[PDB]
Amino acid sequence: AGSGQQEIEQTINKYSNMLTSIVSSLQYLEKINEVIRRAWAVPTHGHELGYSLCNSLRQSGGLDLLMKNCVKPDLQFSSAQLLEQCLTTENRKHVVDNGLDKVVNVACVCTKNSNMEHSRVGTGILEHLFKHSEGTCSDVIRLGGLDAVLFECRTSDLETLRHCASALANLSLYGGAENQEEMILRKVPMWLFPLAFHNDDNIKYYACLAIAVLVANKEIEAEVLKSGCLDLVEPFVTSHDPSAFARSNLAHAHGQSKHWLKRLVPVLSSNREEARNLAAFHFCMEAGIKREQGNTDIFREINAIEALKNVASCPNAIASKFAAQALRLIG
């Protein structure tokens, strides 16, 4: 077993070669899910360890293996549970182009059954599949992915809601004009209201963030305001430490992807102050996460510096201090 937190990389190749040896037996052990699960959960290097294991899973042909055998009944959940953990930026592109129907369908049926663990695996797959493209988000909405995350919004489990809240925030960004319109028809703010008021700071944060991205589209601004969840943003940002809430969320992983933050930049120049208060609250949260690893040039690659400067000068003191500390943590 692996334990501690040292510079030894000899642990990675042992479990990467073991991962490639089990995959090399294709023509059910399924202990690959139990090891990547704990490989992710490493305190400080889990993001470095998990990405290497999932890369060895894609480089050895195991990614194409989980997609073909997910139609077999006795191998459905084990393949989907291992696929839910290894949906990195590299593996996710290969999943969409060849067998997106096989993966979305097994994610929908995992949420329809009364087992909570199957419900968490399903929404965990739909959460990641909403972080690709507009065409991908439109296809998942067509195949029924949007119905499954909204159907799981009535749950009581926390881990399932955390997947359902994070799925709707990713769809709000990667969706676009036509897909955000579809979310208004599916009454997404109707089911984001119970998530926006959750006592869990994780569920409340990403629920409001999804709603904040939805008022950025000037065609649906009135419908998103009808829910009344934007009036909850200000008491949150004025009572939550950005450094501490960066350690409870997106500390394990090295923040959000650059393509994810690029989609959030236009929220900084929105009509509503509550949207700017939360968008700047996220970039001030991402600045320290990026500064720890030394990749602050990400914000210059996504034209986020131009927006943060216009916000650091606006009379709104809430978004002023958040956009200021972010820029000081970048350069």
Curated annotation (Swiss-Prot):
Tissue: Widely expressed in larval brains and adult brains.
Disruption phenotype: Severed axons in wild-type flies disappear completely within a week of injury, whereas axons of neurons homozygous for any one of the three loss-of-function alleles: l(3)896, l(3)4621, and l(3)4705 persist for several weeks after severing. After infection with Gram-negative bacteria, the respiratory epithelium displays an over-active immune response with a greater increase in expression of Drs compared to wild-type larvae.
Localization: Cytoplasm; Cell projection, Axon
Family membership noted in the UniProt record: Belongs to the SARM1 family.
Domain notes: The TIR domain mediates NAD(+) hydrolase (NADase) activity. Self-association of TIR domains is required for NADase activity.
Function as written in the Swiss-Prot or TrEMBL entry: NAD(+) hydrolase, which plays a key role in axonal degeneration following injury by regulating NAD(+) metabolism. Acts as a negative regulator of MYD88- and TRIF-dependent toll-like receptor signaling pathway by promoting Wallerian degeneration, an injury-induced form of programmed subcellular death which involves degeneration of an axon distal to the injury site.
Name of protein: NAD(+) hydrolase sarm1
Protein encoded by which gene: Sarm
